[PDB]
């Protein structure tokens, strides 16, 4: 699975 942080 891909993954996206948006900290
Ligand atoms: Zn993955």
Same mark, same amino acid.
């Given at each position: 699975?891909? /993954?996206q /942080? /948006?900290?």
């Open positions: 699975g891909s /993954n /942080n /948006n900290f």
